[PDB]
Design a protein around this ligand. Structure first.
Ligand SMILES: *[C@@H]1O[C@H](CO)[C@@H](O[C@@H]2O[C@H](CO)[C@@H](O[C@H]3O[C@H](CO)[C@@H](O)[C@H](O)[C@@H]3O)[C@H](O)[C@H]2NC(C)=O)[C@H](O)[C@H]1NC(C)=O
Ligand SMILES: *[C@@H]1O[C@H](CO)[C@@H](O[C@@H]2O[C@H](CO)[C@@H](O[C@H]3O[C@H](CO)[C@@H](O)[C@H](O)[C@@H]3O)[C@H](O)[C@H]2NC(C)=O)[C@H](O)[C@H]1NC(C)=O
Ligand SMILES: *[C@@H]1O[C@H](CO)[C@@H](O)[C@H](O)[C@H]1NC(C)=O
Lengths: 48, 48, 145, 36
């Protein structure tokens, strides 16, 4: 469990707040995001 | 007033049950004025 | 007008005549959706007596005085309650203890003796208060004790 | 990549004494403080 979305409409019609955490430091941004009905994070071993 | 306030805590707990009877207050940790409406929210899961 | 007005006009200074209700304090709305100023559902880019936000001012230099551009800045701030980070060009003195002095800490002026406390302030706290609602302890802003 | 995946189910619980927080950034000790 790592972060949150907060907003009024979540579909880029108006601005909305995103909080994301990871292994160190957090990022916060307020934007006209078009979120996905399921916002989630993937972290995986990239061979390259 | 357009200001988004974040408070938090963590506490070790013995395996009676989560949300145990007892006490601990949340300290303020982050603050930021988004200057927008909020009506709804969700949370980011991290899949492996 | 000397730098924001133009003889062709400067119609990029948009303002909103219409909103479904009055917004609260320090809130800006930039959504471009049609407003139902007609009694029936105006949908899409147009409708009967219906609008987007209002057309900008004719910011033309000849318009006349009190009616041309006026650049405004409003400085909104709070003070005397919390760990400060922006202030006036006043010099710090050295700190003296166990003697009666007119102190000032981050603009908190007063008269008293300053002493080594035994108080565990949490990092977010600048001032400590009493039953009479007056400051009886303070965290020095140069060396954190 | 607009994937659906989250299967969320819920129950209900008593939050006995939890979620109290320091109401303002002023130090206070050995006192009972009434705050709204
Ligand atoms: C947790 O996720 C953070 C992003 O959500 C991530 O922050 C990003 O870190 C990288 C590497 O420091 C930055 O990349 C930039 O680094 C320099 C800037 O001069 C350039 O050489 C690069 O081309 C690139 O621009 C990102 O800018 C930075 N993102 C933000 C929003 O600050 C953290 O590093 C992640 N933490 C861990 C432990 O992985
Ligand atoms: C913050 O965002 C909220 C969601 O956009 C918004 O609430 C919405 O307000 C409008 C206007 O009151 C409602 O519109 C409906 O109002 C009544 C029914 O309640 C009808 O007469 C109208 O035809 C229309 O259907 C929205 O339904 C309402 N939505 C919710 C979830 O409450 C707030 O007004 C916004 N506040 C600010 C300051 O921007
Ligand atoms: C005063 O400013 C200098 C330069 O930034 C800094 O090295 C010093 O630590 C400051 N004084 C105190 C008491 O921290």
């Amino acid at each position: 469990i790592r972060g949150w979305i907060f907003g009024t409409t979540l579909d880029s019609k108006t601005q909305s707040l995103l909080i994301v955490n990871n292994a160190t430091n957090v990022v916060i941004k307020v934007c006209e995001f078009q979120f996905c009905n399921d916002p989630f994070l993937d972290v995986y071993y990239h061979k390259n | 007033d357009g200001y988004f306030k974040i408070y938090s805590k963590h506490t070790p707990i013995n395996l009676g049950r989560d949300l145990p009877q007892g006490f601990s207050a949340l300290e303020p940790l982050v603050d930021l004025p988004i200057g927008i409406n909020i009506t709804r929210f969700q949370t980011l899961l991290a899949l492996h | 007008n000397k730098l924001d007005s133009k003889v062709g006009g400067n119609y990029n200074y948009l303002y909103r005549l219409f909103r479904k209700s009055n917004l609260k304090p320090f809130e800006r709305d930039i959504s471009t959706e049609i407003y139902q100023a007609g009694n029936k559902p105006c949908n899409g880019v147009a409708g009967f007596n219906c609008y987007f936000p209002l057309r900008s001012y004719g910011f033309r230099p000849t318009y006349g005085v009190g009616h041309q551009p006026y650049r405004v800045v409003v400085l909104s701030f709070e003070l005397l309650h919390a760990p400060a980070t922006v202030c006036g060009p006043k010099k710090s003195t050295n700190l003296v203890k166990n003697k009666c002095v007119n102190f000032n800490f981050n603009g908190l002026t007063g008269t008293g003796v300053l002493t080594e406390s035994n108080k565990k302030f949490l990092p977010f706290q600048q001032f400590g208060r009493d039953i009479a609602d007056t400051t009886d302890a303070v965290r020095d802003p140069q060396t954190l004790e | 990549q607009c994937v659906n995946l989250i299967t969320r189910t819920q129950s209900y619980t008593n939050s006995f004494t939890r979620g109290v927080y320091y109401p303002d950034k002023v130090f206070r000790s050995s006192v009972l403080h009434s705050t709204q």
